[PDB]
Amino acid sequence: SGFRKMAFPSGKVEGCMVQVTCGTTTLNGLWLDDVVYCPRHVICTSEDMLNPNYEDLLIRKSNHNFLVQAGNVQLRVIGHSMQNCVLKLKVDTANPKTPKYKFVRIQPGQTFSVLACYNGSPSGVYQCAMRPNFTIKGSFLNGSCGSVGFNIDYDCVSFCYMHHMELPTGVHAGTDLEGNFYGPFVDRQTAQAAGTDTTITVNVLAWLYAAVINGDRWFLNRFTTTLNDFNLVAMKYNYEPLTQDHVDILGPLSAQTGIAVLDMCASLKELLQNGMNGRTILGSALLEDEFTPFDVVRQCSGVT
Amino acid sequence: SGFRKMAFPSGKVEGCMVQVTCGTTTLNGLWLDDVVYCPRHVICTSEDMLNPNYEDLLIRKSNHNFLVQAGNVQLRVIGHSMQNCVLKLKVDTANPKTPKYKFVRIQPGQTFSVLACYNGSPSGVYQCAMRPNFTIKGSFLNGSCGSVGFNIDYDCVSFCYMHHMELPTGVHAGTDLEGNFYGPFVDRQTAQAAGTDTTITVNVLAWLYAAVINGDRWFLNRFTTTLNDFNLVAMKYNYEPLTQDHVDILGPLSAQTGIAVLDMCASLKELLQNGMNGRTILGSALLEDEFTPFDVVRQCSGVT
Numbered sequence: 001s002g003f004r005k006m007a008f009p010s011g012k013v014e015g016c017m018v019q020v021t022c023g024t025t026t027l028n029g030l031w032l033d034d035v036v037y038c039p040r041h042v043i044c045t046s047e048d049m050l051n052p053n054y055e056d057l058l059i060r061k062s063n064h065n066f067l068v069q070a071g072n073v074q075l076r077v078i079g080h081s082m083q084n085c086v087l088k089l090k091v092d093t094a095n096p097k098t099p100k101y102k103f104v105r106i107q108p109g110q111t112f113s114v115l116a117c118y119n120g121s122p123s124g125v126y127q128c129a130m131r132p133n134f135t136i137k138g139s140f141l142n143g144s145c146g147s148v149g150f151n152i153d154y155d156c157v158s159f160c161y162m163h164h165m166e167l168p169t170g171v172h173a174g175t176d177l178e179g180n181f182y183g184p185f186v187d188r189q190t191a192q193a194a195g196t197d198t199t200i201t202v203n204v205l206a207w208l209y210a211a212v213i214n215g216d217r218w219f220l221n222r223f224t225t226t227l228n229d230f231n232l233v234a235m236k237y238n239y240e241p242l243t244q245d246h247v248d249i250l251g252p253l254s255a256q257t258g259i260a261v262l263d264m265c266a267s268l269k270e271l272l273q274n275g276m277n278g279r280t281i282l283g284s285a286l287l288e289d290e291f292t293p294f295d296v297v298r299q300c301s302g303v304t
Numbered sequence: 305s306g307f308r309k310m311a312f313p314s315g316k317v318e319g320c321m322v323q324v325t326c327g328t329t330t331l332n333g334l335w336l337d338d339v340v341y342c343p344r345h346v347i348c349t350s351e352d353m354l355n356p357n358y359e360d361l362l363i364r365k366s367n368h369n370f371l372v373q374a375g376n377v378q379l380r381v382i383g384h385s386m387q388n389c390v391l392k393l394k395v396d397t398a399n400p401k402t403p404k405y406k407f408v409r410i411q412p413g414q415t416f417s418v419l420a421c422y423n424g425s426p427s428g429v430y431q432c433a434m435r436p437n438f439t440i441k442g443s444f445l446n447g448s449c450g451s452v453g454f455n456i457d458y459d460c461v462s463f464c465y466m467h468h469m470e471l472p473t474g475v476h477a478g479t480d481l482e483g484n485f486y487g488p489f490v491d492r493q494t495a496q497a498a499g500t501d502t503t504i505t506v507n508v509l510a511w512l513y514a515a516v517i518n519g520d521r522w523f524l525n526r527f528t529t530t531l532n533d534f535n536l537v538a539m540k541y542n543y544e545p546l547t548q549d550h551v552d553i554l555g556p557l558s559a560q561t562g563i564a565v566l567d568m569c570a571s572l573k574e575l576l577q578n579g580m581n582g583r584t585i586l587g588s589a590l591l592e593d594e595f596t597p598f599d600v601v602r603q604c605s606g607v608t
């Protein structure tokens with residue numbers, strides 16, 4: 001028992017991190033097979049970032065201008081191309097440590113682990129959620145760009161995120177591995193509105209089930225609710241509307257605990273309307289939304 | 305910017321995990337050089353665990369009874385010995401993936417990453433603190449025993465913890481890598497009092513400095529305090545007494561932010577006496593004590 005904000009073991013991803021330098025900018029790259037993927041802003045100086053013409057900036061660069069180092073060994077760049085906001089640097093050597101992998105575009109509300117890196121070296125790993133507004137609340141300093149987000153299903157790493165920037169508000173924006181930004185964000189140093197964010201209702205409910213499984217039960221009540229009634233409360237408190245698809249995904253947790261999803265919704269309703277009253281759930285004094293129903297099942301069953 | 309409960313990259317430790325089976329019990333082992341380290345209770349059946357005579361149980365076991373598998377390959381056991389609560393299984397092959405390592409005994413209040421494993425396979429990684437009462441609040445199910453805690457300084461892994469058991473209260477107990485339990489705990493299925501726990505004051509102050517660095521400043525006030533006055537408040541709220549050694553370790557964070565340690569203590573005093581008033585600090589609605597001053601400096605500077 002016990003429930004923690006657990007990240008995936010990062011080893012398979014650590015073996016893919018490289019340092020990419022172009023001119024005076026250094027950031028991280030992801031080496032999979034004979035291709036290194038990195039944010040295209042590696043070709044910019046901070047001066048260019050105000051309004052960069054990436055096509056023009058990339059034309060002034062040749063394969064020999066992209067310095068790729070994997071630990072202490074230099075990779076020979078034999079091709080370069082821009083795909084959306086990522087550069088793909090073809091190298092003459094396939095990464096011997098390339099794990100089985102996929103590139104996936106996750107949905108808002110889904111979770112993933114981030115391996116924060118600097119100069120191609122791993123600094124740490126943490127679990128986070130893609131917010132409903134397509135930002136992430138990470139921990140990224142200058143040089144962290146190119147650090148990636150991922151999930152792991154047994155031996156296959158699904159890469160879902162590459163870090164590109166910090167918004168003026170301190171939240172983080174990035175792309176899938178085809179270079180497409182999550183959200184309306186552009187790789188330009190400009191005012192960028194992240195939309196209104198909401199709490200991931202299905203995740204909070206999943207976390208309440210994890211709390212019951214692990215012994216924290218004080219919030220369970222004698223009430224029930226309907227999806228319509230619950231959604232009027234979810235609206236007031238800036239929670240995502242709960243759908244039958246969300247109830248269906250909570251099925252296994254409802255079956256394991258014997259607590260009907262709408263009964264757990266009534267507990268969540270009372271917690272929203274009355275607060276925690278100075279009490280905690282799984283060591284938290286707020287309603288946690290960074291665990292999906294899949295994460296709860298995985299952690300509660302010990303999937304490796 | 306941003307501040308997360310970051311774990312160390314687990315790759316170097318993942319390469320050391322093996323599965324150890326003895327009779328009908330399977331748990332995790334740590335393979336470093338030609339030695340596999342695992343909890344000695346691998347030789348017990350649940351029946352033995354009520355009051356085990358480990359010396360007698362181990363005498364009935366031979367090298368061929370310890371089945372050690374590293375992924376899918378079998379290791380040949382050529383020696384076995386018990387050191388405190390750990391078994392050391394000498395194998396005929398040195399782990400090719402053995403990183404530079406040390407065995408260290410951490411102090412209460414210090415933090416480390418745990419690589420949770422099942423059947424010798426990694427499931428996830430999370431950061432936690434050794435509580436002042438020498439327990440840890442982890443996430444461990446049946447089969448997680450032998451999972452280890454560690455810190456990493458550049459290329460050297462300092463192993464500090466090996467998981468052994470869950471107390472009847474749901475908190476976790478384990479040993480250093482020489483098999484010595486942290487705390488008064490015994491590897492026996494019996495009633496075991498974990499002492500009174502307290503909040504790690506120096507860590508909360510370190511986390512308040514991290515909050516100021518990352519923009520969360522609402523808690524800063526016009527007050528100061530003394531170590532004596534602060535400790536009267538720390539006593540009332542079950543916080544560890546702050547010492548000059550703790551103030552000295554907070555030195556770098558005080559210098560970086562320009563906020564005197566006793567001024568930050570006055571903010572902490574007001575937060576203890578008045579609460580958060582429904583506000584948050586770094587995404588938390590409680591005072592976080594699982595970040596040491598070293599962790600804050602490391603994360604705020606991007607150490608790899």
Ligand SMILES: Cc1cc(C)cc(CC(=O)Nc2nncn2C)c1
Nearest residue numbers: 049140141142165166187188189305
């Ligand atoms: C001027 C400029 C403009 C853009 C669009 C991107 C960057 C990189 C960046 O913000 N990186 C970073 N990652 N975490 C925190 N920070 C500061 C820089």
Ligand SMILES: Cc1cc(C)cc(CC(=O)Nc2nncn2C)c1
Nearest residue numbers: 001353444445446469470491492493
């Ligand atoms: C009966 C008995 C007695 C002892 C002293 C140890 C064990 C292993 C154990 O408790 N392992 C475990 N690790 N996380 C959660 N749990 C249940 C079993």
